[PDB]
């Protein structure tokens, strides 16, 4: 269907339902992690065609970075679901690794057979979607800076943690140059067109009561006249 519209009879209920899905579910399994990842990919589709923004999605990005590199004092304010699943200094970061590789049911069934390569693949796929969504949404959005600030903190922390990837610092440079280009003017929204002076229209050019008035005036005229004539007769 046509998703770019503001409201669609069935697309928007799907959006709120899948937002529910993004939000309330607990994150204990890499199955659910990849489930959120593909949920993100499909919202990214919906918004490369519709061009809006999702606070739940940016929250989910934050949460996913934190659950991947949970392995703590930096952000104790996140309430993750899994502390056990963490990636030590064992990543190969070889470019020939697995891509986003959508093998949807296949990935869902083989997820419990979880290699660090699969963890890296889902991580990279998610943050590629994150890069694309950033470059299509947030630099346009005004609050871009404070929107991405937790993302910048996570990315810098993960750089310090690993400093062996490339695409993290790639996104770092992208967002840094973007915020350098931006200006972030203070708000001036409340400004209104003065209301003018009200205007109006002028006026210009009951039959029962009308005929009553005319006949009564006639009668009064006649009574005066007959007075005067009888009086002259008498004199």
């Amino acid at each position: 269907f046509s998703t770019s519209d503001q409201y669609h009879l069935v697309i928007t209920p799907a959006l709120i339902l899948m937002s529910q899905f993004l939000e309330q579910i607990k994150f204990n399994s890499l199955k659910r992690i990849a489930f959120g990842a593909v949920l993100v990919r499909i919202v990214s589709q919906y918004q490369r065609i519709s061009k809006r923004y999702i606070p739940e999605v940016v929250y989910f990005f934050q949460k996913i970075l934190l659950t991947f590199i949970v392995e703590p004092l930096d952000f104790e304010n996140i309430r993750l679901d899994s502390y056990e699943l963490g990636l030590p200094l064992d990543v190969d970061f070889t470019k020939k690794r697995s891509t986003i590789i959508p093998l949807h049911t296949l990935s869902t069934m083989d997820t419990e057979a979880h290699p660090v390569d699969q963890c890296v693949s889902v991580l990279l796929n998610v943050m590629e979607s994150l890069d694309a969504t950033i470059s299509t949404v947030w630099k346009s959005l005004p609050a871009f800076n404070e929107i991405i600030l937790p993302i910048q903190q996570l990315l810098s922390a993960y750089t310090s943690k690993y400093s062996d990837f490339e695409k993290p610092r790639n996104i770092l440079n992208k967002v840094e140059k973007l915020t350098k280009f931006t200006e972030h003017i203070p708000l001036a929204l409340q400004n209104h067109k003065p209301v003018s002076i009200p205007t109006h229209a002028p006026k210009y050019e009951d039959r029962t009561r009308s005929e009553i008035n005319k006949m009564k005036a006639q009668l009064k005229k006649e009574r005066k006249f007959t007075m005067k004539e009888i009086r002259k007769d008498a004199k």
Binding site: L219, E222, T226, E229, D233
Partner: protein, 104 residues
């Protein structure tokens, strides 16, 4: 530095919007038909201050007063508070008599 007090705008009553910026007796007399003395009697039966504006008279008092006003028989309020062709014919007769007197 937390204090906390005990409103609303003009509220309708008996298909009549009761003003939100007037005293109790004033609003009662402004209600369609009622007057100053009947307003005082109703206010006294309801036992509410008369110089408190529409900011006062909280929902319970408002409902009790509304019931009392809607049921004067159940409130025993004083009963002092409740509540052409001939011209044409005359003209024709005038025509006849005047014609006689001014012609003959």
């Amino acid at each position: 530095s937390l204090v906390v007090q005990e409103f609303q705008h003009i509220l309708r009553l008996l298909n009549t919007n009761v003003d939100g910026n007037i005293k109790i007796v004033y609003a009662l007399t402004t209600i369609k038909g009622v007057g100053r003395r009947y307003s005082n009697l109703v206010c006294k039966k309801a036992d509410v201050d008369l110089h408190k504006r529409a900011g006062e008279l909280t929902q319970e008092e408002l409902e009790r007063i509304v019931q009392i006003m809607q049921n004067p028989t159940h409130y025993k309020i004083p009963a002092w508070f409740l509540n052409h062709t001939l011209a044409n014919n005359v003209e024709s007769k005038l025509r006849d008599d005047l014609e006689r007197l001014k012609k003959i």
